[PDB]
């Protein structure tokens, strides 16, 4: 179990990464901005669906009761988001947030 700390012995660290935290809010702000071209009946849908509002990973079932309409079309907006949003990525560099 190592000689504890022979001869501040060994550095190594990667938990409260500074850049990760700076880019954490950044990647978040980028989304807050990347969601400006979205509609409530789509953005919020993704918010509650992909657990974003806070942490609740509610599904289409819980997102359909409060959103008047039911499943499908609220699901056809989910896909609409994957496309209408993706169509705004191939022309706008932003695929550099995965490696984080």
């Amino acid at each position: 179990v190592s000689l504890e700390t022979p001869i501040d012995f060994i550095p190594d660290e990667n938990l409260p990464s500074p850049v990760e935290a700076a880019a954490q809010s950044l990647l978040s702000e980028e989304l807050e901005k990347a969601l400006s071209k979205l509609s409530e009946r789509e953005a919020m849908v993704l918010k509650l669906r992909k657990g974003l509002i806070d942490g609740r990973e509610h599904t289409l079932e819980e997102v359909g009761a409060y959103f008047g309409v039911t499943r499908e079309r609220i699901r056809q907006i989910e896909n609409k988001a994957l496309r209408k949003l993706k169509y705004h990525e191939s022309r706008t560099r932003k695929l550099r947030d995965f490696l984080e």
Binding site: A22, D97, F98
Partner: protein, 528 residues
């Protein structure tokens, strides 16, 4: 004569001869006793990142008893550095204090070049939660830069790679960070899905522009490898790289005169000798000549002398080779040098005549016969007039020129430089240290802070402990600010101080942030 064999740098020759060498990478045998092939070290490997080679020197048959040189040697003769024509003189200031001047001539012929190797090692841990394995389909890393020079995992041998590339892309099921809230969107938006292995690879270190010589897979299942328990697949690759010669580095011959390459002016300029051969290296005094006096110039005078006369004199310590010994040698060298000129179709130059008017009164050369002799004695203890390829007129004054010895120390510049930003980090220590991509580092000596505060610098001083380093929760403020907008940095929030208060809190000691009001007793540490 023994430093080449005793050090076993090179090889040897047993009994008779008759080599019939095939050369290449495996010296043949000798008709002495049996048939034994002498395999070269094949560039081998160094412990200082140098890698020595051993080129042969024979064919058909020969014996006496050298046989193939070694690292830095030539015909059983120890050759560490490299000797080149130099000239003592100041030039615009590209040799102040004790710096050194270099020409482009050396680079054109790659005169000064070396080799540096470095061994890598990527072990595939087995944290049980998720074993690691080397694959060529790293998640999210789906690109050409991979499949092109990676494949099957390890990089192909003989593939030139630069810094910021993959070498041993190992996959680990180690799931430390589950999917993030708003991150699940950018993951579904695109055509890709999620992940469960992460990139996690080797990634070339901050400096490596060469090629691979060969790899080596050392995984378990082999009882012939004493490895760390629980470890599997210990990739080990060797990356090479040519050194060439940029700017800087230490020359320092064999006397003490050490310096650094300032600027390498391409041919054009530099003192042009009255027959071509532009001064390759300029060694201006200052530093050790007058102060820590030495005897290196005694090589220059006998350098060009051995150049023209075509010889490499041997000067044993405390024996032979004295001032008068240079006289006899200089005589032959002169008549041979001026000989060509005088017979080439000319003799004595105007610009080479005014220089004598200097020594004349200067008491250097004795007045008497034509410039012929004045240029002779000026060669015995000095050199020819010499000119300047940049300006246009010759350097008014007797300048010395000759071949001495210009070595090169291990300490260079490339692997002796560093640069970073907020990228570095060393959790628990609360300071920039470590990194799987950049091993940056920088210390602020104690004798440095006092000087910084000596000035009116109070915000710059504090800054060194405000955002950067200390305040981890503050490191973002600045870097996050500038990137977004102007704004002035935070008031400062020390990180180590919180650790100091804690470490010092291990005991009764209660580091209270007593406010100026006294009775309130301020305290900043409640997770804000």
């Amino acid at each position: 004569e023994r430093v080449v064999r005793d050090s076993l740098a090179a090889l040897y020759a047993e009994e008779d001869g008759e080599v019939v060498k095939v050369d290449g990478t495996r010296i043949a045998v000798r008709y002495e006793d049996g048939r034994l092939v002498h395999p070269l070290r094949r560039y081998a490997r160094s412990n200082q990142g140098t890698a020595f080679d051993q080129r042969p020197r024979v064919r058909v048959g020969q014996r006496v008893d050298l046989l193939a040189d070694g690292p830095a040697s030539e015909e059983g003769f120890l050759a560490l550095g490299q000797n080149v024509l130099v000239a003592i003189m100041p030039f615009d200031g590209y040799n102040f204090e004790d710096a050194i001047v270099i020409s482009e001539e050396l680079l054109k012929r790659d005169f000064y070049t070396s080799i540096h190797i470095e061994r890598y090692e990527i072990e595939a841990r087995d944290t049980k939660l998720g074993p690691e394995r080397i694959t060529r389909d790293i998640p999210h890393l789906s690109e050409a830069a991979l499949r092109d020079l990676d494949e099957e995992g390890i990089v192909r041998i003989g593939a030139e790679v630069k810094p910021g590339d993959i070498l041993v892309g190992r996959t680990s099921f180690k799931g430390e960070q589950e999917p993030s809230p708003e991150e699940r969107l950018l993951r579904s938006i695109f055509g890709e899905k999620a992940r469960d292995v992460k990139d996690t690879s080797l990634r070339v270190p901050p400096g490596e522009g060469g090629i691979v010589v060969g790899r080596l897979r050392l995984r378990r299942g082999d009882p012939g490898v004493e490895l760390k328990p629980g470890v599997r697949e210990v990739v080990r690759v060797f990356v090479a790289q040519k050194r060439k010669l940029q700017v800087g580095d230490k020359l320092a011959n064999r006397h003490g005169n050490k310096g650094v390459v300032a600027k390498i002016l391409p041919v054009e300029d530099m003192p042009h000798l009255p027959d071509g051969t532009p001064v390759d290296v300029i060694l201006n005094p200052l530093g050790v000549p007058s102060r820590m006096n030495l005897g290196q110039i005694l090589e220059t005078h006998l350098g060009l002398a051995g150049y023209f006369l075509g010889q490499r004199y041997i000067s044993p310590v405390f024996d032979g080779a004295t001032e008068p010994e240079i006289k006899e040698l200089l005589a032959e060298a002169f008549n041979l040098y001026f000989g060509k000129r005088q017979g080439e179709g000319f003799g004595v130059d105007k610009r080479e005549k005014e220089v004598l008017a200097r020594a004349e009164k200067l008491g250097l050369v004795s007045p008497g016969k034509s410039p012929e002799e004045q240029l002779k004695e000026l060669f015995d203890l000095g050199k020819v007039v010499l000119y300047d390829g940049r300006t246009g007129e010759p350097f008014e004054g007797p300048i010395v020129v000759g071949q001495m010895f210009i070595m090169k120390l291990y300490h260079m510049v490339e692997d002796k430089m560093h640069a970073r930003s907020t990228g570095p980090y060393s959790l628990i220590t609360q300071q920039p240290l470590g990194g799987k991509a950049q091993f940056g580092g920088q210390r602020f000596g104690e004798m440095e802070v006092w000087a910084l505060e000596a000035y009116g610098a109070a915000h710059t001083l504090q800054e060194m402990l405000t955002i950067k380093s200390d305040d981890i929760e503050g490191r973002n403020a600045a870097y996050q600010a500038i990137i977004k907008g102007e704004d002035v940095p935070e008031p400062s929030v020390p990180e180590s101080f919180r650790v100091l208060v804690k470490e010092l809190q291990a005991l009764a000691l209660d580091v209270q942030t007593l406010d100026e009001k006294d009775n309130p007793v301020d305290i900043f540490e409640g997770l804000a």
